[PDB]
């Protein structure tokens, strides 16, 4: 478990000016502090920290990784390849655990939503509708953090089962906003919080498809 913190400073003249003009300045700084805490938690979950020995979901050494041909190459689309790779990932989840666990959720980059909406030839429905018909009980969603998984510009897809016994995140303590400490003519307000990260108890229930 870890601890997070920041602070902000404000003087008395700024307080008077904010009260006079009707646009207070302390509330904006408090909002910035809260946003910084939340964004740090998100960054810890999706990128990790090498010095702190925090490992991201993409860098776990015991999860299944599948190299894939591009779903979009030379500005043309390949829905067939996408469907084949999705079915292969679901089959991998089913096989590697020997039927004990089954895939439930898929996360894809939001820029690949156009590939799965193409109408199949000589019919009135798209690839996504057929896939959902043949794979009842699976949800599909788009996540922005999947637009870059290594810092170099490659994409990826996550197939997993969302159960509390497989993975978890803990937030033992919430944002608190400690009292203010006066000085000569200004103040200082510190803020703290607590978090753990992503804990993966069963690493065989996650498949990452790279090169998408």
């Amino acid at each position: 478990v870890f601890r997070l913190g920041n602070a902000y400073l404000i003087s008395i003249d700024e307080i008077k000016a904010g009260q006079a003009t009707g646009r207070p300045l302390s509330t904006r700084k408090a909002s910035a502090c809260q946003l910084a805490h939340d964004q740090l938690v998100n960054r810890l979950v999706f990128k990790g920290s090498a010095p702190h020995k925090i490992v991201s979901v993409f860098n776990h050494p015991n999860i299944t990784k599948i190299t894939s041909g591009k779903w979009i190459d030379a500005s043309t689309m390949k829905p067939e390849t996408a469907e084949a790779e999705l079915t292969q990932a679901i089959e991998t989840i089913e096989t590697i655990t020997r039927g004990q666990h089954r895939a439930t959720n898929i996360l894809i980059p939001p820029s690949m939503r156009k590939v799965l909406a193409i109408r199949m030839p000589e019919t009135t429905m798209s690839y996504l509708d057929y896939f959902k018909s043949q794979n009842s009980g699976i949800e599909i969603d788009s996540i922005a953090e999947l637009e870059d998984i290594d810092g170099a510009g490659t994409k990826g897809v996550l197939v997993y089962e969302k159960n509390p016994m497989n993975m978890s995140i803990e937030i033992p303590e919430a944002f608190n906003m400690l009292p203010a400490q006066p000085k000569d003519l200004h103040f200082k307000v510190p803020c703290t919080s607590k978090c753990t990260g992503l804990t993966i108890y069963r690493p065989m229930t996650i498949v990452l498809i790279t090169g998408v």
Partner: peptide, 27 residues
């Protein structure tokens, strides 16, 4: 000598209340 603290490592520690067993399907 022994210059240690006031709380042992087991007084600040948690044991998860659920275990995991491997599965071998018979056939």
């Amino acid at each position: 000598a022994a210059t240690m603290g006031i709380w042992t490592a087991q007084e600040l520690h948690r044991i998860k209340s659920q275990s995991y067993e491997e599965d071998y399907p018979v056939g």
